[PDB]
Structures are given as C-alpha cells and as structure tokens.
A paper describes a structure:
Modulation of voltage-gated potassium (Kv) channels by auxiliary subunits is central to the physiological function of channels in the brain and heart. Native Kv4 tetrameric channels form macromolecular ternary complexes with two auxiliary β-subunits—intracellular Kv channel-interacting proteins (KChIPs) and transmembrane dipeptidyl peptidase-related proteins (DPPs)—to evoke rapidly activating and inactivating A-type currents, which prevent the backpropagation of action potentials. Here we report cryo-electron microscopy structures of the Kv4.2–DPP6S–KChIP1 dodecamer complex, the Kv4.2–KChIP1 and Kv4.2–DPP6S octamer complexes, and Kv4.2 alone. Thus, our data suggest that two distinct modes of modulation contribute in an additive manner to evoke A-type currents from the native Kv4 macromolecular complex.
The structures of Kv4.2–KChIP1 show that the Kv4.2 protomer comprises an N-terminal cytoplasmic domain with an N-terminal hydrophobic segment of approximately 40 residues in length (referred to as the inactivation ball), the T1 domain, a transmembrane domain with six transmembrane helices S1–S6, and the C-terminal cytoplasmic domain. The C-terminal intracellular S6 helix continuously extends from the transmembrane S6 helix toward KChIP1, which was not observed in previous studies. In addition, the intracellular S6 helix interacts with the T1–S1 linker in the structure of the Kv4.2–KChIP1 complex. The Kv4-specific topology of the T1 domain would facilitate the proper interaction between the intracellular S6 helix and KChIP1. The present structure of the full-length Kv4.2–KChIP1 complex reveals that the C terminus of Kv4.2 tightly interacts with both KChIP1 and the N terminus of Kv4.2. The C-terminal cytoplasmic S6 helix continuously extends from the transmembrane S6 helix and terminates at S450, which is localized at the bottom of the complex. The structural comparison between Kv4.2 alone and the Kv4.2–KChIP1 complex provides insight into how KChIPs modulate the gating of Kv4s. First, one KChIP1 stabilizes the S6 conformation as well as the N terminus from the neighbouring subunit of Kv4.2. Third, previous functional studies have suggested that the T1–S1 linker of Kv4 dodecameric channels undergoes major conformational shifts tightly coupled to movements of the S6 tail, although we do not know what the T1 conformational change is. Together, these structural features mediated by KChIP1 may allow synchronized and accelerated S6 gating to enable fast CSI and recovery.
Author numbering:
A (entry chain A), B (entry chain G): 2 to 35, 40 to 157, 163 to 210, 215 to 450, 472 to 495
C (entry chain D): 2 to 35, 40 to 63
D (entry chain L): 36 to 186, 191 to 216
Write the structure that this text describes.
Amino acid sequence: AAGVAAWLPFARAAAIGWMPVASGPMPAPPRQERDALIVLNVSGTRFQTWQDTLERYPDTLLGSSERDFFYHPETQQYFFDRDPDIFRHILNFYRTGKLHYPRHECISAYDEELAFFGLIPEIIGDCCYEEYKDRRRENAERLQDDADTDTAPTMTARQRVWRAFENPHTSTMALVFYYVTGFFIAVSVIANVVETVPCGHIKELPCGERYAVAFFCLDTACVMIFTVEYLLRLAAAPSRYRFVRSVMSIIDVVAILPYYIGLVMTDNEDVSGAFVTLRVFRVFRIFKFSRHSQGLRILGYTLKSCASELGFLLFSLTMAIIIFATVMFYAEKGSSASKFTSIPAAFWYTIVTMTTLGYGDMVPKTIAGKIFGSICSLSGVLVIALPVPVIVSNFSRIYHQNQRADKRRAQKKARLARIRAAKSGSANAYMQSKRSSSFETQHHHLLHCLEKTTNHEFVD
Amino acid sequence: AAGVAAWLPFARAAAIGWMPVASGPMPAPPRQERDALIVLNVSGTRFQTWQDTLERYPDTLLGSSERDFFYHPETQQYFFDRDPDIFRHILNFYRTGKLHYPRHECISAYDEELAFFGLIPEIIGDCCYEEYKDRRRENAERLQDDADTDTAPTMTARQRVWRAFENPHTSTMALVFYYVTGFFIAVSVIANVVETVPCGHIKELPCGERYAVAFFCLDTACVMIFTVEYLLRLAAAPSRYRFVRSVMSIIDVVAILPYYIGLVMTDNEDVSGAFVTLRVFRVFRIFKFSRHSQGLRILGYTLKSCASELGFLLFSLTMAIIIFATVMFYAEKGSSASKFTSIPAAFWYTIVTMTTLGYGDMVPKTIAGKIFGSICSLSGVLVIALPVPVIVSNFSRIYHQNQRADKRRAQKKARLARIRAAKSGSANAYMQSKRSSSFETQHHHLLHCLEKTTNHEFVD
Amino acid sequence: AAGVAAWLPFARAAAIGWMPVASGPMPAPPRQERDALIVLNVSGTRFQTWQDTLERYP
Amino acid sequence: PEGLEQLEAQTNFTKRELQVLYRGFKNECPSGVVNEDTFKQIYAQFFPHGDASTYAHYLFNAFDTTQTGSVKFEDFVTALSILLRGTVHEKLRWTFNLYDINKDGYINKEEMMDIVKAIYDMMGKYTYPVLKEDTPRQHVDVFFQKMDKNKTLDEFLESCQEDDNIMRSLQLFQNVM
C-alpha cells in the first residue's frame, strides 16, 4: 500500500529475484521525475514534515490537491486556522497510520479537527479507541437529553388536556386532578385496610359483615373514578393503541378490572374460589402511584435495565436453595421430632436461613445438620450480596442522570434566551443605524435592500 | 450576525433573487474600502490569525480598539503577557464561537484569562459546560469555607461568654462548663435508667417507690442546671429570637419542659395518662449531646441533606408493607391457629420479615404463604438496600469536608502570617535604608514623604 | 510592596493630597535613570516578558 | 476608551505611557474597572506600617467622579495626569474636592478632620513621638491658621500660591514619571 512507501526500494530489490526465473518483456519502468520539508503553520505554531509523508494518504486534506486552498504563497507555507495542539495528532497519523486520542481534549473539538482534515473516527488506533467511544457516548447522550423535545393549542382540547395529564405540575386544573387522584387512591387503600381489620357478641365479627355497606359504595366510586380518568386519558392519546400497550395503561387496566370481574361473577352464581384472588388483586391500585412519584418510575427503570442480573440472582438462588435443602433433608431426616419431612419442606428453612432471617420453628438438631445450616447462611449472604450493589449503583446513576437532565433543560432555555436576545440586539442595532463597524455596514445594507424590495420598513 | 461573516457573498448572491420581484430604488451599496494575517505574541508563543477572524466579535478585547493598547509598534505585533496555553482556547472561540474548557487547567486561571480578554463564562460550549460548573462549584466552595469568619472584648461580657459557649475547647471556664454539662447529662440519664430498674417482701418493688426520694432531687437539680444554662445562652445570643428558632434551642426547650409540665399537672389533681408520656419525654436530654459530639451534628446534617431520599424510603416501605401484608393475610387466613387476624396484624409480620429480623411467633403455615413470605424478605432487602448507601455516602462526604475545612482554616492563618511577615519585612527594609533595588528606592521615597508631611519618623 | 509596581504613578498621584496639609522639606526625589521585553529561551521555546515583570520579585 | 482619544489631547501621557499604565492597570483588574475594595488592596501595599483603607476610601471618591461606584480606566488616567503632570490650577481643585467630602464645596474643620486623621492613621503606631490622640487636631489647627481668614475654594487657591514651599512640593513627581 501507500503507507509503506519508503520501502519501495526494498520491494524493488526483492523483485530482482524474479528476473532469473522470468521471461524479460521490457516491463517499461515509469521513469519518474526524480524532497525539502514543508511548513504547516496551524495558527502560529509551524509544523514541518516532508511532503512525501503527507502524500502517503491521498484521500484526506493534507495529502491531496485540497491543501492548495490553504497555501499562503508569499510566505511559502500552508496556513491553517485550526487548533495547534490537536493538529499535532493529525501529523502523527501521517507518520505511523494510527490516530491517538488526547485524554485532556474535548471530544467535540477533536471530532471537529478530524472532520476538517478528512480523517475518520474509524482509523483511530486500538490503543485508545475504547476510551474514545466512551467519551463519545457521553457527548452523544448530552445531545439526546438536550434534544428530547420537552417544549409544551391550535387544535382541539385533546392535546391541551394531554399536556395537563402528562405534566400535572403545570396549570391549575392538572394539579387539582393530580391531588384528587392521589387522595382517591390513598382513601381506597386505607378503606381496604380498615375493612380487613375487625371493628367490634356472637363472634368477633370483622368490619366486612355488619359494616361494608358504605365501603362497597366507596370502592365502586373509586373504581368509577379510575375508569373515567382512564377514558379521559384515552381521549387524549395520539398513540392510543401504543398507549394501551404501554406499562402504565396495563397497570391501570389491571387495577380497574377486579371490580367489574367480581360483579360479572356475582351476577350469575357465587363461589369463594376467585373471591380471595380478586381481593388480592384489588390492592394493585398501589402501583398507580408511579405517575405521582418519580421514585417508583426510577425504580422500575433500574429494575428493567439490569434484568439480566436479576435473572442470575433467581438462578443462583434456586440452585443454592435446592442444593442446601437436599443436604439438610438427607442430613436431618432420622430425627425424633423433625419438621424436615422433604426437600420442599426444606425450602422454607433454606430460604429463611439464606436471607439471615431466622425463625426457630424449623431448626436442625444434628451435628451434621448444623454445619450445613451455617454454611447455608454464609452462602446465602454471599449469593444475595452479589447483585445488590449493582441494582443500587444503577438506581443511583439513573437518579443522578435524571437530576442531571433537569439542569440540562434549564441551560437550554437560557441559550435560547441569549439567541433571542442576540436576534433582538441585531434587529435593534439596525434601527439605531437607520435613525442616525466594518461588517455591520454591509449587513445593514442587505436589510435595507430587503426593506425596499417589499416597500416596507422595520420599526421598533 | 457577525459570526457568519465569510458568508456575506453568499447572502449577497441570495439577494439577487429579490431583484426580479422588486422595485429598484438604487439602494446605495456602501462601497467599502476593498487581509494579511496578524501576530498575537502571548509571551513568546506567537499566534497568527487573520484580522477579520478577530473582528467578527466586536465586543471583546481581541476584536476591538482595545487591543491597540497591547500593540507593540516596532515589532509589528500584539504582545500580551498572558498564559500561552490558555490563549489557545481564546482564538478557538473567534473561529467557531464556542469556548472549550481544558480539563488539565486550573479554573481560577481559566476565569482570569476569560475576564482579561472580554469573554464570559456564559458563552462556553455545551460540550464542556457541565464540567466547567462542577469545577467552578468546588472553587466557589473553597472560597466560602476559607471566608467563613471563624476569627474569635470591646463590649460587655455577652460576646466574650458566647464565644466560650459556642467554642468550649478554648479558655478554661468554657471547658469546665462543657465537662460539667456533659457529666450532668450523663448522671441524669443513668439515674433514670437506675430508677427504672428494680433495686430489691410484699412485692418486687422497683427503685421508684421505696427509693426515688433523692432521685427527684437529682432530677430537679439537673433540670435547674439545664434551665440556667439555657438562660445564660439566651443572655449572650445576638439572634435571640432566631437562636430560639434554631434546632438546638428547640431541643433544649423540649428537654427542659417535662419537669415543669409534670409539676404543673401534679399541682392540681393527678392522673397517669400523661405520666408515661412525660417519663418518655424525659430521655430527650440525650439529644443535647449534639453540641458535645461533632458526630451527632454530622449525622443530623446528613439526614437533613438527603431528606427526599428518606421520604422515598418511607413511601416505598409503606407500599411494600401494605402489599405484602394484604397478600399474606388473604393467603394465611383460613389456618387452624393463625395469628394473621387482619392486615394491621400482618403489618408486624411484614415489617419483621422485610428487615430480615425474624421472631418465629408469627409465621406462615401454608404453601402459598411461605412463598410470599420469602418474596417479602427479598423485597425488603431490595427496598432497604437502596437508600442506605446514599445516606452513608453523604455522611462520609460531609465528614471528610468538615475535616478538610479544618486544615483549610489552618492554611489561612499561615497565609496571614506570611502577609504580616512581608509587611514587617517591608517596614524593616525601609529602616535599613534609612540607617545607611530599583523600585525599592522609589517606594522608600514615598515613605520618606509620608514621614515629612507629619514631622514624624518610623522607628524600630 | 514590589508586586504592585506598575501602580507607582498611582501612589505618587495619591501623595499629591498630602502637599496642601504638609510642611515641604524638599523630600529629595531619587531622580532615577529613566523597557524592551527580554527573551527567556528555556531549551528551544523562547519566552518573552518585560524585564520589569521579573524584577518585581527580587 | 480608544488609546488615541486619551492621547496628548488634554491627557499628559504619551502613546507608550498609556500602554504601560493599561498593561499594569488591567493586570490587577482584568475587567477594565477597579472598585473601592480593590482600590484599597494596592494602596495598602505601599504603606505596610499601618492601614491605608481609611485614606483610600476618600481617595477613591475623588477618583470616582459622579459616584458611579467603580472608576474606569478612561477617568482613572485623567486623574493621574492632572495629579502627576497637570498644571498648578488643576492639581489644587482636585485636592480641594478630595477634602470636600460632601456635595457643596466647603471645608469646616470636620470634613478634613478625617482626612488628616487618615494620613496619621496610615502610619500605624510605630513612630518616634509615639503619636498622640490630639496630634491630628493640632495639624488641622495650624493648617487653618494660614488660609482661614474669617471662616473656601478661592481662599484655598490663593493661599497655596502665596507660599512657594507647597508650590515646589506639588510639582515633585512631574519630572520622574
């Protein structure tokens, strides 16, 4: 290739071996023309390399006819107006062939020089390419967070009520709706808790037999409120099908189903098989607090992100539980009064000991059993202690980046204010010239031409 | 704007499209005058840019008539006496428009060059602005810690006794008062502990019926000491109302109230309803150790700082407790001898299992219940393990920064000693000249003039 | 001190206020001699500063 | 703020001299304006025996015309030119307004009570006579004995010109910088 160009005499010397075993056709050597080092003055700091060094990569700015645009003839040097300490790594490419990433330079300026001089991020050396992408990812995430389109009535009420539903902290009706929904969820769960606990005789009757006449009314009112708010959310979702497919709508429908399901079952016959199941499902209105509190959303995001680690947690937990339950069952089987009737019976003891919980109702009573119980406790500590830090670390990182994006949006509005201020200042500067610099004189002539092609005039 | 100034011929070319649809009034083009690159020698390292590059931002030092002050005429170059490796980022602004922050440069020197050349920290590029503020915050905190005014009798005894109260480690009376207050708190709490425990028959009488004649005397002596020291603190607080509003004064008031409240209650009638409450409140003199130990203050600061995380802890704890209590109640309800009488009754089991505490008095006895109990234990581990590291991390950071500001104050006193030593050396140098450099000769003439305008003389 | 040496004309200007309330003894001004920048070539890279800049820390 | 505007155009500094001052002026205050807090930092360095903050406060007000709050290089130089290389008339009015703390131009033995006290204060307490509490008042008392005939701007101007001793001390620094 052209990279190893100084070794052409070596390759031509190697070709001499072919001549004895060849049939000389007069292969017509090219008969070339015949090397002083040239100056590359990148804004004051002159850089000197041989012209042959640059020409070995004839697809970039430095090795090309493109640098003839940057040639300064009277000084007999090439003058570039670029960074002097980032162009140093440009020349190191033309010598070796691998780019080096400076750890102390901003990656938004490093990529600017690579694009200018024709180099590409695909040719940077393997020595520093892992960190180059790592620093590129952070810059890329900065662009994505800054361009998330958080801006928030030319059409119907759907969009202007969805902006209230999505962001309840704005306006005055959105906050009222948010507060009333939170209060209804809280009163529903508290009412369930109270109707479960006894209140008061023939028997210690709970609050669900003599009472729970108005409790049913409260439950159906809460269910009706949830259904109507879900319908209002549906009437303002541009992604109606995708919105239903979203996790929040799934949680909402799961929360609202039990009342209607129970009514359907109680309309025709009545059994207690699905009564307790529906009562259990009724508490699922708790998860509706995800919209209200950012903490639940962050927790859900961090559980979804490290889903593989939770799978390993479950797999190792099951492995250790099975192994230790089998060991304890076969080691504590022949006891007089033993609760270790089977390995499934030993699952309870194994999961109690592994989590360092301890109950004392089911304990080993053999020398062999106690040693394996202690080993089981230590192994449970080891197994559970592995995925705990990564979950907490991911949660903390996600929370910090969510607070980081909060101030990232704040600076975006500040920049737009300065851009608008510059636009207002530029417009006002023209008026001051009209009432009474170098480029400003020519720029104001363009605006003067724009005035007089439409027979109109800008005014304050 | 003036930033895109090389595209003026493009904008003038675009204006040609207006002419066919215009009404030509002879818009009077400005007829400008008519570009060699100039040298910016910032202390040895010459920097070369076109003059048009600098003029595109005519509100800073480089693009202005202000640089005519730094023009060196005989060398035909602009000589600045500034940093050569920080002026590199100044020129990169005049080309692109965005400042770049060097990760390897001190921010107190970076801001010095920005202020010198007219740039502002508001125009630095978004690529590196998150780091710039973070490094600016650390420098800002360094200024605040160094200027906390920790210096410590021209007026009454109030200030000179408050400096003893605030800082008990100095003087000799302050340390004695600190020790006696600590001893009184310790003896009061130990006396409460002893009077609670039985000391010795008709019955196993505790130490509060046959005894507790002198215990009341000790308690009232401790309460009197607390009240008088609070009054002395009040008699030396310039912020008396704000001092009362402070947390320490609130704790002191809460600690001293129960004795007087009990005396008032027992003056007229006597019931046991508020007796146990006041006895419980009596132990609140423990929290008065906050002044004595820096650890309590650091713990309070770290709990107050991450108050939002504690709120999320409480919310998630209540969420999980309610969910798991409902599940266990509805899963372990029909057992023969079941202690899971209600959801509030299952609250105890849920909070015992989630914290991995374990008691064994209330345990599930069903296959469905045991699985959900194990899931409850694992979920409690997950929920509690999330906010624990952030509390510990904040505590460690606060402790480190509090022990780092300790040596920050030490370097301030040493710095002032060097300033005073220089002042003494400068004054002594004048005396040596009087008894028997370039600038020193002229400076000593000024002091000589100061001597002879007031017919006085400095002496050793 | 010698660190603020370029402000000597400012300090001498401030001393003018003393003269109305003074008793002029002819304080004998030193009558000094009268500034090109010098080169400090530290192994190839020349550094240029005024000689007065270096002399302020003698 | 041009460099040629404040050239020898009622400013007694040459082009090179203006460059020297601006290089030193912008060295301490890169923003181009110096405030009272910084104004006392440089002045206190020249007189380490005592504190010059009391005198610099009155000096700053004379420099800071119209009580803007900060004194700019444009009107910082014109104060130096008047004081250093200015004429006799311009120096006396500048010093008269330095003593004249209030708006109207009048000296009542109390406005300059602090002025003379500041001059004695900026020496510390290290002098041979060990100073005194009433020694600034004696200096003021003898000061008024030579211009205060009955009980102004005209009196101050003619009194200084009457005795040549102060005249030859006002022009002390015009020859050397």
